[PDB]
UniProtKB/Swiss-Prot annotation, chain A:
Belongs to the universal ribosomal protein uL3 family. This is Large ribosomal subunit protein uL3. It comes from Thermus thermophilus (strain ATCC 27634 / DSM 579 / HB8). GO terms for biological process: translation. One of the primary rRNA binding proteins, it binds directly near the 3'-end of the 23S rRNA, where it nucleates assembly of the 50S subunit. The mass differences between the observed and calculated masses are suggested to be due to methylation, which is known to occur in the E.coli and R.palustris orthologs. The lineage of its organism: Bacteria, Thermotogati, Deinococcota, Deinococci, Thermales.
Curated annotation (Swiss-Prot), chain C:
Part of the 50S ribosomal subunit. Contacts protein L32. Keywords: Ribonucleoprotein, Ribosomal protein. GO terms for molecular function: structural constituent of ribosome. One of its GO terms (biological process) is translation. Belongs to the bacterial ribosomal protein bL17 family. One of its GO terms (cellular component) is cytosolic large ribosomal subunit. PANTHER family: LARGE RIBOSOMAL SUBUNIT PROTEIN BL17M, RIBOSOMAL PROTEIN L17. Transmembrane segments: none annotated. The gene is rplQ. This is Large ribosomal subunit protein bL17. It holds the Pfam family Ribosomal_L17.
UniProtKB/Swiss-Prot annotation, chain E:
The lineage of its organism: Bacteria, Thermotogati, Deinococcota, Deinococci, Thermales. Contacts the 16S rRNA of the 30S subunit (part of bridge B6), connecting the 2 subunits. Keywords: Ribonucleoprotein, Ribosomal protein, RNA-binding, rRNA-binding. Part of the 50S risobomal subunit. Contacts protein L14. Forms a bridge to the 30S subunit in the 70S ribosome, contacting the 16S rRNA. This is Large ribosomal subunit protein bL19. Pfam families: Ribosomal_L19. InterPro entries: Ribosomal_bL19, Ribosomal_bL19_CS, Ribosomal_bL19_sf, Translation_prot_SH3-like_sf. It comes from Thermus thermophilus (strain ATCC 27634 / DSM 579 / HB8). SUPFAM superfamilies: Translation proteins SH3-like domain (SSF50104). Belongs to the bacterial ribosomal protein bL19 family. GO terms for molecular function: rRNA binding; structural constituent of ribosome. GO terms for cellular component: cytosolic large ribosomal subunit. GO terms for biological process: translation. Transmembrane segments: none annotated.
Swiss-Prot record, chain F:
InterPro entries: Ribosomal_bL32, Ribosomal_bL32_bact, Ribosomal_zn-bd. It comes from Thermus thermophilus (strain ATCC 27634 / DSM 579 / HB8). Residues 1-22 have a biased composition (Basic residues). It comes from the Bacteria. Found on the solvent side of the large subunit. GO terms for biological process: translation. This is Large ribosomal subunit protein bL32. Part of the 50S ribosomal subunit.
Amino acid sequence: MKGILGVKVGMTRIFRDDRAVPVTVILAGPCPVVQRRTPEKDGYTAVQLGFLPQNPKRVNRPLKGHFAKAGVEPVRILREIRDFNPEGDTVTVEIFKPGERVDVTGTSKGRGFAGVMKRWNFAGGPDSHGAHKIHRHPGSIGNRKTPGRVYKGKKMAGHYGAERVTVMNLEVVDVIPEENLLLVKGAVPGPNGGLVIVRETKKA
Amino acid sequence: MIQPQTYLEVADNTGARKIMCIRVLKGSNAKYATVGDVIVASVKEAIPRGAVKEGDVVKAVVVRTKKEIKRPDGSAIRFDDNAAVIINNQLEPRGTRVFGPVARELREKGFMKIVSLAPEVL
Amino acid sequence: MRHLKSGRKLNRHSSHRLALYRNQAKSLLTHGRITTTVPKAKELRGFVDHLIHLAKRGDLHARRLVLRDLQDVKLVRKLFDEIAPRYRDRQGGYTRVLKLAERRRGDGAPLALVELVE
Amino acid sequence: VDKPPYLPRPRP
Amino acid sequence: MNRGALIKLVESRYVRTDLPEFRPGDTVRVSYKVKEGNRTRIQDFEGIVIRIRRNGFNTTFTVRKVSYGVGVERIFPLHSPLIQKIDIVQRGRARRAKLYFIRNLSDREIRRKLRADRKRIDQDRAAERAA
Amino acid sequence: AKHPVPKKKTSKARRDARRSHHALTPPTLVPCPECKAMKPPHTVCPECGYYAGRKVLEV
RNA sequence: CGAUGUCGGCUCGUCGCAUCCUGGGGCUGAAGAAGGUCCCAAGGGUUGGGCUGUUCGCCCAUUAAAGCGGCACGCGAGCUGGGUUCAGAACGUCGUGAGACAGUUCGGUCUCUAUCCGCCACGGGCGCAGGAGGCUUGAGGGGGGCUCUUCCUAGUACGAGAGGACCGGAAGGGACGCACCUCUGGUUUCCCAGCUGUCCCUCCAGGGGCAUAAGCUGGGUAGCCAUGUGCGGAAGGGAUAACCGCUGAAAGCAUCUAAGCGGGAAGCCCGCCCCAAGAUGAGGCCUCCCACGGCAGCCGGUAAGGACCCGGGAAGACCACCCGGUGGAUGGGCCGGGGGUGUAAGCGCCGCGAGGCGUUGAGCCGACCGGUCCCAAUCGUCCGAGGUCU
RNA sequence: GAAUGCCGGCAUGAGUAACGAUAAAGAGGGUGAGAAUCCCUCUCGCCGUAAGCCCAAGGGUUCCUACGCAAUGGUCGUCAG
RNA sequence: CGUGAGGGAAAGGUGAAAAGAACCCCGGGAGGGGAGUGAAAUAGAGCCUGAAACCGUGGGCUUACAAGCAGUCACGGCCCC
Ligand SMILES: [Mg+2]
Ligand SMILES: [Mg+2]
Ligand SMILES: [Mg+2]
Ligand SMILES: [Mg+2]
Ligand SMILES: [Mg+2]
Ligand SMILES: [Mg+2]
Ligand SMILES: [Mg+2]
Ligand SMILES: [Mg+2]
Ligand SMILES: [Mg+2]
Ligand SMILES: [Mg+2]
Ligand SMILES: [Mg+2]
Ligand SMILES: [Mg+2]
Ligand SMILES: [Mg+2]
Ligand SMILES: [Mg+2]
Ligand SMILES: [Mg+2]
Ligand SMILES: [Mg+2]
Ligand SMILES: [Mg+2]
Ligand SMILES: [Mg+2]
Ligand SMILES: [Mg+2]
Ligand SMILES: [Mg+2]
Ligand SMILES: [Mg+2]
Ligand SMILES: [Mg+2]
Ligand SMILES: [Mg+2]
Ligand SMILES: [Mg+2]
Ligand SMILES: [Mg+2]
Ligand SMILES: [Mg+2]
Ligand SMILES: [Mg+2]
Ligand SMILES: [Mg+2]
Ligand SMILES: [Mg+2]
Ligand SMILES: [Mg+2]
Ligand SMILES: [Mg+2]
Ligand SMILES: [Mg+2]
Ligand SMILES: [Mg+2]
Ligand SMILES: [Mg+2]
Ligand SMILES: [Mg+2]
Ligand SMILES: [Mg+2]
Ligand SMILES: [Mg+2]
Ligand SMILES: [Mg+2]
Ligand SMILES: [Mg+2]
Ligand SMILES: [Mg+2]
Ligand SMILES: [Mg+2]
Ligand SMILES: [Mg+2]
Ligand SMILES: [Mg+2]
Ligand SMILES: [Mg+2]
Ligand SMILES: [Mg+2]
Ligand SMILES: [Mg+2]
Ligand SMILES: [Mg+2]
Ligand SMILES: [Mg+2]
Ligand SMILES: [Mg+2]
Ligand SMILES: [Mg+2]
Ligand SMILES: [Mg+2]
Ligand SMILES: [Mg+2]
Ligand SMILES: [Mg+2]
Ligand SMILES: [Mg+2]
Ligand SMILES: [Mg+2]
Ligand SMILES: [Mg+2]
Ligand SMILES: [Mg+2]
Ligand SMILES: [Mg+2]
Ligand SMILES: [Mg+2]
Ligand SMILES: [Mg+2]
Ligand SMILES: [Mg+2]
Ligand SMILES: [Mg+2]
Ligand SMILES: [Mg+2]
Ligand SMILES: [Mg+2]
Ligand SMILES: [Mg+2]
Ligand SMILES: [Mg+2]
Ligand SMILES: [Mg+2]
Ligand SMILES: [Mg+2]
Ligand SMILES: [Mg+2]
Ligand SMILES: [Mg+2]
Ligand SMILES: [Mg+2]
Ligand SMILES: [Mg+2]
Ligand SMILES: [Mg+2]
Ligand SMILES: [Mg+2]
Ligand SMILES: [Mg+2]
Ligand SMILES: [Mg+2]
Ligand SMILES: [Mg+2]
Ligand SMILES: [Mg+2]
Ligand SMILES: [Mg+2]
Ligand SMILES: [Mg+2]
Ligand SMILES: [Mg+2]
Ligand SMILES: [Mg+2]
Ligand SMILES: [Mg+2]
Ligand SMILES: [Mg+2]
Ligand SMILES: [Mg+2]
Ligand SMILES: [Mg+2]
Ligand SMILES: [Mg+2]
Ligand SMILES: [Mg+2]
Ligand SMILES: [Mg+2]
Ligand SMILES: [Mg+2]
Ligand SMILES: [Mg+2]
Ligand SMILES: [Mg+2]
Ligand SMILES: [Mg+2]
Ligand SMILES: [Mg+2]
Ligand SMILES: [Mg+2]
Ligand SMILES: [Mg+2]
Ligand SMILES: [Mg+2]
Ligand SMILES: [Mg+2]
Ligand SMILES: [Mg+2]
Ligand SMILES: [Mg+2]
Ligand SMILES: [Mg+2]
Ligand SMILES: [Mg+2]
Ligand SMILES: [Mg+2]
Ligand SMILES: [Mg+2]
Ligand SMILES: [Mg+2]
Ligand SMILES: [Mg+2]
Ligand SMILES: [Mg+2]
Ligand SMILES: [Mg+2]
Ligand SMILES: [Mg+2]
Ligand SMILES: [Mg+2]
Ligand SMILES: [Mg+2]
Ligand SMILES: [Mg+2]
Ligand SMILES: [Mg+2]
Ligand SMILES: [Mg+2]
Ligand SMILES: [Mg+2]
Ligand SMILES: [Mg+2]
Ligand SMILES: [Mg+2]
Ligand SMILES: [Mg+2]
Ligand SMILES: [Mg+2]
Ligand SMILES: [Mg+2]
Ligand SMILES: [Mg+2]
Ligand SMILES: [Mg+2]
Ligand SMILES: [Mg+2]
Ligand SMILES: [Mg+2]
Ligand SMILES: [Mg+2]
Ligand SMILES: [Mg+2]
Ligand SMILES: [Mg+2]
Ligand SMILES: [Mg+2]
Ligand SMILES: [Mg+2]
Ligand SMILES: [Mg+2]
Ligand SMILES: [Mg+2]
Ligand SMILES: [Mg+2]
Ligand SMILES: [Mg+2]
Ligand SMILES: [Mg+2]
Ligand SMILES: [Mg+2]
Ligand SMILES: [Mg+2]
Ligand SMILES: [Mg+2]
Ligand SMILES: [Mg+2]
Ligand SMILES: [Mg+2]
Ligand SMILES: [Mg+2]
Ligand SMILES: [Mg+2]
Ligand SMILES: [Mg+2]
Ligand SMILES: [Mg+2]
Ligand SMILES: [Mg+2]
Ligand SMILES: [Mg+2]
Ligand SMILES: [Mg+2]
Ligand SMILES: [Mg+2]
Ligand SMILES: [Mg+2]
Ligand SMILES: [Mg+2]
Ligand SMILES: [Mg+2]
Ligand SMILES: [Mg+2]
Ligand SMILES: [Mg+2]
Ligand SMILES: [Mg+2]
Ligand SMILES: [Mg+2]
Ligand SMILES: [Mg+2]
Ligand SMILES: [Mg+2]
Ligand SMILES: [Mg+2]
Ligand SMILES: [Mg+2]
Ligand SMILES: [Mg+2]
Ligand SMILES: [Mg+2]
Ligand SMILES: [Mg+2]
Ligand SMILES: [Mg+2]
Ligand SMILES: [Mg+2]
Ligand SMILES: [Mg+2]
Ligand SMILES: [Mg+2]
Ligand SMILES: [Mg+2]
Ligand SMILES: [Mg+2]
Ligand SMILES: [Mg+2]
Ligand SMILES: [Mg+2]
Ligand SMILES: [Mg+2]
Ligand SMILES: [Mg+2]
Ligand SMILES: [Mg+2]
Ligand SMILES: [Mg+2]
Ligand SMILES: [Mg+2]
Ligand SMILES: [Mg+2]
Ligand SMILES: [Mg+2]
Ligand SMILES: [Mg+2]
Ligand SMILES: [Mg+2]
Ligand SMILES: [Mg+2]
Ligand SMILES: [Mg+2]
Ligand SMILES: [Mg+2]
Ligand SMILES: [Mg+2]
Ligand SMILES: [Mg+2]
Ligand SMILES: [Mg+2]
Ligand SMILES: [Mg+2]
Ligand SMILES: [Mg+2]
Ligand SMILES: [Mg+2]
Ligand SMILES: [Mg+2]
Ligand SMILES: [Mg+2]
Ligand SMILES: [Mg+2]
Ligand SMILES: [Mg+2]
Ligand SMILES: [Mg+2]
Ligand SMILES: [Mg+2]
Ligand SMILES: [Mg+2]
Ligand SMILES: [Mg+2]
Ligand SMILES: [Mg+2]
Ligand SMILES: [Mg+2]
Ligand SMILES: [Mg+2]
Ligand SMILES: [Mg+2]
Ligand SMILES: [Mg+2]
Ligand SMILES: [Mg+2]
Ligand SMILES: [Mg+2]
Ligand SMILES: [Mg+2]
Ligand SMILES: [Mg+2]
Ligand SMILES: [Mg+2]
Ligand SMILES: [Mg+2]
Ligand SMILES: [Mg+2]
Ligand SMILES: [Mg+2]
Ligand SMILES: [Mg+2]
Ligand SMILES: [Mg+2]
Ligand SMILES: [Mg+2]
Ligand SMILES: [Mg+2]
Ligand SMILES: [Mg+2]
Ligand SMILES: [Mg+2]
Ligand SMILES: [Mg+2]
Ligand SMILES: [Mg+2]
Ligand SMILES: [Mg+2]
Ligand SMILES: [Mg+2]
Ligand SMILES: [Mg+2]
Ligand SMILES: [Mg+2]
Ligand SMILES: [Mg+2]
Ligand SMILES: [Mg+2]
Ligand SMILES: [Mg+2]
Ligand SMILES: [Mg+2]
Ligand SMILES: [Mg+2]
Ligand SMILES: [Mg+2]
Ligand SMILES: [Mg+2]
Ligand SMILES: [Mg+2]
Ligand SMILES: [Mg+2]
Ligand SMILES: [Mg+2]
Ligand SMILES: [Mg+2]
Ligand SMILES: [Mg+2]
Ligand SMILES: [Mg+2]
Ligand SMILES: [Mg+2]
Ligand SMILES: [Mg+2]
Ligand SMILES: [Mg+2]
Ligand SMILES: [Mg+2]
Ligand SMILES: [Mg+2]
Ligand SMILES: [Mg+2]
Ligand SMILES: [Mg+2]
Ligand SMILES: [Mg+2]
Ligand SMILES: [Mg+2]
Ligand SMILES: [Mg+2]
Ligand SMILES: [Mg+2]
Ligand SMILES: [Mg+2]
Ligand SMILES: [Mg+2]
Ligand SMILES: [Mg+2]
Ligand SMILES: [Mg+2]
Ligand SMILES: [Mg+2]
Ligand SMILES: [Mg+2]
Ligand SMILES: [Mg+2]
Ligand SMILES: [Mg+2]
Ligand SMILES: [Mg+2]
Ligand SMILES: [Mg+2]
Ligand SMILES: [Mg+2]
Ligand SMILES: [Mg+2]
Ligand SMILES: [Mg+2]
Ligand SMILES: [Mg+2]
Ligand SMILES: [Mg+2]
Ligand SMILES: [Mg+2]
Ligand SMILES: [Mg+2]
Ligand SMILES: [Mg+2]
Ligand SMILES: [Mg+2]
Ligand SMILES: [Mg+2]
Ligand SMILES: [Mg+2]
Ligand SMILES: [Mg+2]
Ligand SMILES: [Mg+2]
Ligand SMILES: [Mg+2]
Ligand SMILES: [Mg+2]
Ligand SMILES: [Mg+2]
Ligand SMILES: [Zn+2]
């Protein structure tokens, strides 16, 4: 496995072989390793990556300590990549060359309290022919006396989005290392400015 | 974006003027037909003594749609109507002329005879 | 949702909101300082700031523009001749909002003052 | 399937 | 960080600087590279531009023409690499930015509604006088 | 609808357990650096009229 | 019977398996392809329409298929109300009659507020023997699980011919799912413009209100979106079902079995995605504070940190989450860019005039990308360890 | 101790539904122990074959002025039928 | 309450005596705190007695890994005599 932290910057398309290819631009580098998890010590293998520089005037004492033991300027975000152990003490976009497929994780956009139609694509009610104040309602939620209750997991209105999402097997279309940019084909979860994780894909 | 109930102009000299799609022949359950797709249609309107007559159930390939179609080069194309050419079960025209331009997508989908017969291919 | 939308609704329809702002502007430019609810105040700033900035242009076009909201020729004269000159060298920020300490008795509304800047 | 109703509808 | 400038930096390698300016109402001939198996060629599409939707590198323009009795609209990206060149054939004078309305007009009615843009025509002929 | 209705009276226990969240939070107050009177932060002092060092208001 | 609302539809599922399809098999009167018949298999799938109130059924066009049942003939404190139980009216029929009819016909009041359990979301509390800021393991859960066409192998094997494979390989789809907004396409309640009537400011010119909760019309950014775009189903390992074997007695032969060992499903376990230590079985790692004053307890002040308050936020019903608070770019102004509109007002010129031309892509200008301390996040307060016993 | 008993008192639902046309408000100045709600001014909106004006029914002091705010007013009240 | 015939309530108690609380204090008032009266003022006029449901303040014991017609039997802990 290999991975990097990054922020989603925005979308475009580029032209390649007389084709328009939709891309999301990701600012991925550069990510200092600030701790390594080892099987002797932690029971598993991973690298704690840091990302984005922080005003030391905002970093408290327990955090300051942590950074210091690794000799790293204070960073805004700390996040692990599992089963990844890079030779260097800094991970940059260069771990990816164009043509590789990656998995991207982000925090999906938040729709707050979502009705049953937006959330679960329910059909809702009719809009004429007698429908009585039930146009976006979910219908029946059960049976009768048997079982006389509602299943765990019943699709229902409630909060939707602002949740971890990973979309898989996105083509790396380009990488522009002098600017820490990754171009991934297609769509990535979450808003512009959102923190994302780019890992080497698990599909074959 | 053609679907059952959709009326199409017929762009040939089969005698049919207007057909009404009753199925899009593309899988178990396709919702829409676009340029290059075969549909099954009822001949809703024809002219006296053609190959085809009002009432006939025929096959046709869509050659023009009013919904614009997108292309891998980033472009699109859109026509003033939805038109089709009536074919046989071997996908050949049953007419001998086809009228108006047609979508280049037809060539790539093996409706070669129709493409050639067309005055313009866009 | 409301994602990246600018502008309070203030529980008024479209034409009422516009009038709300215009009337507050008239009042503010008239007295130099008014008291309102905090949300109304915060929202007044830009509305009036733009009007002042225009008076700093001084030209006819700007006068006729400002007249669309303020509607009162004397008021706009005061705006162009007495008010705007104070801000010749000020780059925006011609108004301030400061919150009062007491809530209205009858509805508990939190209050603020809005004033033109020195 | 179609069986006779055993209750009437309503009232006040 | 400036997310906007980053995107512009990505886009910059594909940006075109060599096409003539045109407006809605102008009559244009777009020479477009087209694949027909197994060869590619230039096919000319010529019509009134009824729309130009701006978004930097992503702006696109829509062209309308009547072909063999049927109306055809084509949507091109202003920076597409498959555009060999664009020729201004005529300058028309719109009074609005989107000309969807011409879709319901007779060829005669259109001609009355999109008079020749004498100003910019003269300007065109005014350049075209090169050292 | 068919007019829902409480099935059983709520117990003194249960009614009061609902109210385990009903206690008021006392007002947050800071001294005004001028007159040392207690007032809510980020408001102009209602006693002497000062905010951010200056007199702003006739009290 | 001091009421358990009754057909059908809609919505939402969930289960069974006597399996409609897809997967694996045995026999075939199985040449091939395609069928029959039984066995294993419930993971997923199982279309749109005409007729009828219909369930059902027939029919049209497709499909891999167009499964059958249970859940109060699932579901009216979810909807419908076509059928059927009221009162009106008519037909046929029966009755001298009033009236009646598993005969028909047209019409005919379906109840804003959820206490408890259950369900979907979100917090508050306390606990996790010192108090804290982070980063995590994953017990255990949940999600997903579909399939077709074409091409190569190969017109090969098989067949007189028609027809036409196994295995293996490549491409393109339909339906569904998650995310997204570059493109396509919507919306965009005031972003711009045009227009009518009327009243008004100020007579002209230029404007404002009202005509909807936008007067109307043409456009329309960001956002939220699908008709648009990316991506998913796997791969793979393991154990099995039916079924096929290897070796092999009892039983000198034979036997898949009694010892042992193989192969073998879309199914089962892992693998993928998401939740998760209230996992009270309360886990782990990194870092920080520290050994305070007064009689496993009480009180007092602090530490590391936290909260309150404030500016905000593609976060959000409140709460929470996240960012920022002058050692600052958090919002508001302002400036530059984008973007929309599509050439403002004023003036000059031409025309008797409506107008037109130039100044001019002008003027106006939400949210988008940035800059800039001009305005406001002033000033502060409160809580918060001293670590129980083997 | 029960009669869906009778009369009364007090609970629960609950700080919940609601506060009675979506014609609509904002500010400044007064008054007062106290003001979103009372008086005044300016700005805004609504009716105008009416939501203006005058008769007749019916009502019966509700009219005007002074002094008041316990209750009545769906909130407040210094105002008021 | 009902057009009407007609129907038809609820509502008793300071103290022996008003001696019914001057005066001061907080409050706009209501209300209270002192002073005073009385044998007695939780007899203060919302007045004899003043039960119960119901609401609240203070204290003892107890409760945030637990399964219920709420009790009962046993034992242990704590608090009181
Ligand atoms: Mg590991
Ligand atoms: Mg491991
Ligand atoms: Mg490893
Ligand atoms: Mg909604
Ligand atoms: Mg929705
Ligand atoms: Mg959804
Ligand atoms: Mg949908
Ligand atoms: Mg539907
Ligand atoms: Mg719908
Ligand atoms: Mg529906
Ligand atoms: Mg109804
Ligand atoms: Mg409705
Ligand atoms: Mg049950
Ligand atoms: Mg759940
Ligand atoms: Mg749900
Ligand atoms: Mg959330
Ligand atoms: Mg992951
Ligand atoms: Mg792929
Ligand atoms: Mg792929
Ligand atoms: Mg490239
Ligand atoms: Mg993250
Ligand atoms: Mg034709
Ligand atoms: Mg006919
Ligand atoms: Mg036929
Ligand atoms: Mg909304
Ligand atoms: Mg915003
Ligand atoms: Mg807003
Ligand atoms: Mg606004
Ligand atoms: Mg707001
Ligand atoms: Mg409202
Ligand atoms: Mg509202
Ligand atoms: Mg309002
Ligand atoms: Mg308006
Ligand atoms: Mg209006
Ligand atoms: Mg506005
Ligand atoms: Mg004054
Ligand atoms: Mg602005
Ligand atoms: Mg305030
Ligand atoms: Mg306050
Ligand atoms: Mg207050
Ligand atoms: Mg009030
Ligand atoms: Mg951008
Ligand atoms: Mg840059
Ligand atoms: Mg550009
Ligand atoms: Mg123009
Ligand atoms: Mg003519
Ligand atoms: Mg010229
Ligand atoms: Mg209803
Ligand atoms: Mg209750
Ligand atoms: Mg009870
Ligand atoms: Mg009870
Ligand atoms: Mg309760
Ligand atoms: Mg209690
Ligand atoms: Mg409760
Ligand atoms: Mg101060
Ligand atoms: Mg019964
Ligand atoms: Mg009942
Ligand atoms: Mg009942
Ligand atoms: Mg139906
Ligand atoms: Mg329905
Ligand atoms: Mg329906
Ligand atoms: Mg079930
Ligand atoms: Mg099912
Ligand atoms: Mg079973
Ligand atoms: Mg089972
Ligand atoms: Mg079976
Ligand atoms: Mg069977
Ligand atoms: Mg069978
Ligand atoms: Mg099968
Ligand atoms: Mg099979
Ligand atoms: Mg088989
Ligand atoms: Mg055979
Ligand atoms: Mg066979
Ligand atoms: Mg055979
Ligand atoms: Mg058999
Ligand atoms: Mg078989
Ligand atoms: Mg059978
Ligand atoms: Mg199954
Ligand atoms: Mg099933
Ligand atoms: Mg159907
Ligand atoms: Mg059907
Ligand atoms: Mg019909
Ligand atoms: Mg039907
Ligand atoms: Mg029908
Ligand atoms: Mg039927
Ligand atoms: Mg039938
Ligand atoms: Mg088959
Ligand atoms: Mg069917
Ligand atoms: Mg079924
Ligand atoms: Mg079922
Ligand atoms: Mg049954
Ligand atoms: Mg049924
Ligand atoms: Mg039923
Ligand atoms: Mg039922
Ligand atoms: Mg009902
Ligand atoms: Mg029903
Ligand atoms: Mg029910
Ligand atoms: Mg029920
Ligand atoms: Mg419902
Ligand atoms: Mg009916
Ligand atoms: Mg009927
Ligand atoms: Mg029935
Ligand atoms: Mg009957
Ligand atoms: Mg009748
Ligand atoms: Mg008889
Ligand atoms: Mg008779
Ligand atoms: Mg007889
Ligand atoms: Mg009888
Ligand atoms: Mg009868
Ligand atoms: Mg019957
Ligand atoms: Mg009967
Ligand atoms: Mg019969
Ligand atoms: Mg009938
Ligand atoms: Mg009937
Ligand atoms: Mg009727
Ligand atoms: Mg109902
Ligand atoms: Mg009822
Ligand atoms: Mg209702
Ligand atoms: Mg409610
Ligand atoms: Mg409840
Ligand atoms: Mg219960
Ligand atoms: Mg919690
Ligand atoms: Mg600890
Ligand atoms: Mg922690
Ligand atoms: Mg592990
Ligand atoms: Mg597990
Ligand atoms: Mg558990
Ligand atoms: Mg599952
Ligand atoms: Mg599942
Ligand atoms: Mg596939
Ligand atoms: Mg071959
Ligand atoms: Mg052959
Ligand atoms: Mg052959
Ligand atoms: Mg060949
Ligand atoms: Mg071979
Ligand atoms: Mg042979
Ligand atoms: Mg052959
Ligand atoms: Mg194959
Ligand atoms: Mg596929
Ligand atoms: Mg966009
Ligand atoms: Mg768009
Ligand atoms: Mg668009
Ligand atoms: Mg549009
Ligand atoms: Mg504006
Ligand atoms: Mg006007
Ligand atoms: Mg005029
Ligand atoms: Mg005018
Ligand atoms: Mg306006
Ligand atoms: Mg007016
Ligand atoms: Mg208007
Ligand atoms: Mg009006
Ligand atoms: Mg109106
Ligand atoms: Mg509009
Ligand atoms: Mg307007
Ligand atoms: Mg658009
Ligand atoms: Mg937009
Ligand atoms: Mg926006
Ligand atoms: Mg779609
Ligand atoms: Mg796919
Ligand atoms: Mg496998
Ligand atoms: Mg294996
Ligand atoms: Mg195996
Ligand atoms: Mg053997
Ligand atoms: Mg042997
Ligand atoms: Mg042997
Ligand atoms: Mg064995
Ligand atoms: Mg044995
Ligand atoms: Mg085995
Ligand atoms: Mg599969
Ligand atoms: Mg996690
Ligand atoms: Mg824990
Ligand atoms: Mg955890
Ligand atoms: Mg357990
Ligand atoms: Mg423990
Ligand atoms: Mg822990
Ligand atoms: Mg561990
Ligand atoms: Mg760490
Ligand atoms: Mg110390
Ligand atoms: Mg020490
Ligand atoms: Mg100590
Ligand atoms: Mg000591
Ligand atoms: Mg501190
Ligand atoms: Mg949000
Ligand atoms: Mg907020
Ligand atoms: Mg809060
Ligand atoms: Mg903070
Ligand atoms: Mg501070
Ligand atoms: Mg400052
Ligand atoms: Mg800022
Ligand atoms: Mg700014
Ligand atoms: Mg700007
Ligand atoms: Mg522009
Ligand atoms: Mg001009
Ligand atoms: Mg001009
Ligand atoms: Mg003249
Ligand atoms: Mg003249
Ligand atoms: Mg020029
Ligand atoms: Mg400008
Ligand atoms: Mg601009
Ligand atoms: Mg830019
Ligand atoms: Mg900005
Ligand atoms: Mg400043
Ligand atoms: Mg600076
Ligand atoms: Mg302390
Ligand atoms: Mg020891
Ligand atoms: Mg008894
Ligand atoms: Mg009762
Ligand atoms: Mg009762
Ligand atoms: Mg009784
Ligand atoms: Mg009783
Ligand atoms: Mg009672
Ligand atoms: Mg109560
Ligand atoms: Mg509440
Ligand atoms: Mg409730
Ligand atoms: Mg509520
Ligand atoms: Mg009400
Ligand atoms: Mg409410
Ligand atoms: Mg009212
Ligand atoms: Mg109201
Ligand atoms: Mg209202
Ligand atoms: Mg209002
Ligand atoms: Mg207001
Ligand atoms: Mg005042
Ligand atoms: Mg006085
Ligand atoms: Mg005074
Ligand atoms: Mg008031
Ligand atoms: Mg008051
Ligand atoms: Mg006032
Ligand atoms: Mg009012
Ligand atoms: Mg004024
Ligand atoms: Mg009039
Ligand atoms: Mg009228
Ligand atoms: Mg009289
Ligand atoms: Mg009266
Ligand atoms: Mg009176
Ligand atoms: Mg007098
Ligand atoms: Mg009163
Ligand atoms: Mg009062
Ligand atoms: Mg009062
Ligand atoms: Mg009273
Ligand atoms: Mg009085
Ligand atoms: Mg009141
Ligand atoms: Mg009332
Ligand atoms: Mg007073
Ligand atoms: Mg008075
Ligand atoms: Mg009066
Ligand atoms: Mg009466
Ligand atoms: Mg009377
Ligand atoms: Mg008494
Ligand atoms: Mg006496
Ligand atoms: Mg006094
Ligand atoms: Mg008073
Ligand atoms: Mg007193
Ligand atoms: Mg007293
Ligand atoms: Mg005595
Ligand atoms: Mg005494
Ligand atoms: Mg006393
Ligand atoms: Mg006593
Ligand atoms: Mg006594
Ligand atoms: Mg006595
Ligand atoms: Mg007593
Ligand atoms: Mg008493
Ligand atoms: Mg008592
Ligand atoms: Mg209490
Ligand atoms: Mg107690
Ligand atoms: Mg346990
Ligand atoms: Mg315990
Ligand atoms: Mg328990
Ligand atoms: Mg029990
Ligand atoms: Mg017990
Ligand atoms: Zn002060």
